């Protein structure tokens, strides 16, 4: 009898497929929590799932996609707790709704492409940043559409993700180079469109993914090239920062301590930046193309009370 906390349920099926990502894995674990542990009373169910979400955030704090999944699960159990079935059917009604995310959010990524293929037009040199697999889910259907384009992939120092794209869509058959991440300003005068992928959307439209998407965003603004971001609808999160600095990793982004003998010195600054709403200009979700004030309204309506 599993306890669903850390790895007795969650981290097992992350090794089943390296295509499922973190937040829908969190959705799958949280629905299979109360799919079995349903002790016929509406009180301790919500206590169990709130305890489970807080210990799962307590497992890995610096992967804020997890917070997005573990909080839209609370929105799911709140709205499915609504319609007021007196808990007599909801013990069966909520769990038969249940797996509609793993039948729904799993097949959201081609629904992204079905509305985002009509962005990359003919002969567009494209800049992507980091292994954001929804961007590749758009680009796969774009190359299957037989449309002519070129791609440029940045480095993802120190998180290594930029080396994956050049070994991902090269074998699909797209002419692609791998620029280094510092060389954006000398090339973004030539890049037609730039895509990124978020690990979170704030309450105004923000990109909380990686090391330097604020840098490539402010390069996109002072080259006046359109800065799109491909995401999907399990990436909304309540966390609305105000600076370019989020929750810390373990200390401040500006360390000034002493290296003892030979410890690592690359990851000493920040690793997850923030982008304001001005630098993004259109984001892609399951809900269509979505201007950032629309994503602000969409995350302002389902989070108030």
């Amino acid at each position: 009898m599993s306890e669903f906390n850390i790895t007795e349920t969650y981290l097992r099926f992350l090794e089943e497929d390296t295509e499922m990502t973190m937040p829908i894995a969190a959705i799958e674990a949280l629905v299979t929590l109360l799919r079995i542990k349903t002790p016929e009373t509406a009180a301790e169910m919500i206590n169990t799932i709130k305890s489970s979400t807080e210990e799962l955030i307590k497992s890995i704090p610096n992967s804020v996609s997890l917070r997005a999944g573990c909080d839209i699960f609370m929105r799911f159990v709140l709205r499915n707790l609504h319609l007021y079935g007196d808990w007599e059917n909801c013990k069966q009604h909520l769990i038969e709704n249940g797996q509609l995310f793993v039948s729904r959010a799993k097949k959201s990524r081609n629904k992204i492409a079905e509305i985002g293929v009509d962005f990359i037009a003919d002969d567009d040199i494209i800049l992507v940043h980091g292994y954001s697999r929804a961007v590749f889910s758009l680009l796969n259907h774009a190359a299957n559409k037989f449309i002519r384009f070129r791609c440029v992939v940045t480095e993802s120092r120190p998180s290594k993700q930029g080396n994956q794209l050049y070994t991902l869509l090269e074998q699909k058959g797209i002419p692609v180079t791998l620029i280094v991440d510092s060389a954006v300003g000398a090339v973004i005068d030539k890049v037609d469109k730039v895509f990124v992928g978020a690990e979170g959307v704030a309450e105004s439209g923000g990109i909380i993914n990686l090391v330097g998407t604020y840098s490539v965003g402010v390069l996109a603004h002072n080259a006046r090239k359109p800065f799109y971001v491909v995401t999907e609808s399990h990436k909304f999160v309540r966390m609305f920062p105000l600076s370019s600095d989020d929750l810390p990793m373990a200390g401040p982004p500006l360390d000034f301590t002493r290296r003892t003998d030979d410890l690592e010195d690359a990851l000493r600054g920040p690793t997850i930046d923030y982008t304001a709403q001005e630098y993004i200009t259109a984001l892609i979700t399951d809900l269509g193309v979505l201007t950032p004030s629309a994503v602000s309204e969409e995350l302002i309506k389902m989070w108030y009370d």
């Binding site: 929105r75 709205r79 038969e96 509609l100 995310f101 009509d118 004030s293 389902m302």
Partner: protein
């Protein structure tokens, strides 16, 4: 019947530029849809949305670069879609009707498990009264403009306008002198070779009501951009970004010179000019015209190639406010008016769901 000849004679009228602008094509396609709904045989309302939607698909496929004939049909599809839900919830005994206008548009599609009761003919009469109040909305769009834009303009400010060919700016700039007594002047550029038969008529109509006017040419607008405090745009269609599609020319650059001098940019617009689409590829929503009237040499063999443009797009960044008949709105708050008058379904208005 005698309705299938009418819908293609209106198609062939809208192909070959016999109707133009944004007012006239909207009134004509609305007249055509009233002729259609007066002779419809649906037997169920979900058949009627298909019978009104394939017509819209054929008519949008006929001529995509005029949007007033493509959004009135979406708007009446929305207002006929709305009364499905109202009737349906009420009929069910168990939960009746919530009757709440605003809903979160993400999540309710992510939990799906699957008297005057029907009165089958009422969809016909409610579509006819929707036709009638669409007429009674489009025919008087200037009232909200002349109500709220005087709150947004002040007195001793010289103005610029790059769209002379709009009746909205003409009626507003006449009624700003007729009732109110705010004196000013209006610089006006000509969109050569298109608005040069209109900008001079625009200056004539403003000199009849004698508001201090003067005509600038296109090349002499940057020198006079430092003097002018405000521009104003009488647009043709405006998208969910606020990136509008204008009249003849000029406005893709003079609005940029307005943005670079931090000069405010207005945009008056009727509510029928909206579109729940998106500028996917911006050149596809831009009507490049003919090369006849920009050099009348007609070079036979030397044949220097050339480019004309009868549509200038502005992005939402260059534009500042939208004066509509339902209030003033940000360029980043044009989506919600669209979803207040359209739905998620009729933006990919096509039977072949690919």
């Amino acid at each position: 019947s005698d309705v299938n000849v009418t819908i293609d004679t209106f198609v062939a009228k809208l192909k070959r530029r016999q109707v133009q602008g944004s007012y006239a094509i909207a009134l004509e396609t609305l007249q055509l849809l009233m002729r259609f709904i007066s002779a419809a045989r649906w037997n169920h309302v979900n058949d009627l949305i298909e019978q009104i939607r394939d017509l819209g698909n054929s008519l949008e496929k006929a001529h995509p670069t005029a949007f007033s004939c493509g959004n009135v049909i979406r708007r009446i599809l929305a207002v006929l879609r709305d009364e499905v839900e109202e009737d349906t919830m009420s009929t069910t005994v168990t939960s009746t009707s919530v009757a709440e206008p605003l809903i979160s548009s993400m999540f309710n599609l992510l939990q799906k498990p699957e008297s005057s009761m029907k009165t089958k003919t009422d969809y016909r009469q409610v579509a006819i009264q929707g036709i009638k109040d669409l007429i009674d909305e489009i025919k008087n769009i200037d009232e909200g403009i002349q109500q709220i834009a005087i709150d947004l303009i002040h007195d001793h400010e010289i103005l610029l306008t790059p769209t002379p060919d709009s009746k909205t700016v003409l009626k507003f700039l006449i009624t700003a002198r007729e009732r109110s007594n705010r004196t000013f002047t209006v610089l006006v550029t000509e969109g050569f070779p298109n608005n040069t038969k209109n900008a001079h008529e625009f200056a004539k109509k403003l000199a009849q009501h004698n508001i201090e006017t003067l005509v600038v040419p296109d090349s002499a607008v940057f020198a006079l951009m430092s003097r002018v405090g405000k521009v104003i745009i009488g647009t043709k269609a405006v998208f969910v970004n606020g990136g509008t599609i204008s009249s003849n020319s000029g406005v893709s650059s003079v609005c940029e010179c307005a943005r670079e001098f931090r000069t405010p940019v207005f945009a008056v617009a009727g509510l029928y000019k909206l579109s729940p689409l998106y500028p996917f590829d911006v050149e596809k929503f831009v009507e490049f015209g003919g090369s006849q009237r920009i050099l009348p040499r007609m070079d036979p063999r030397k044949r220097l190639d050339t480019v004309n443009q009868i549509t200038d797009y502005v992005p939402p960044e260059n534009i500042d406010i939208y004066i509509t008949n339902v209030g003033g709105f940000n360029p980043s708050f044009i989506y919600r008016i669209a979803w207040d008058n359209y739905k998620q379904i009729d933006v990919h208005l096509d039977k072949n769901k690919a």
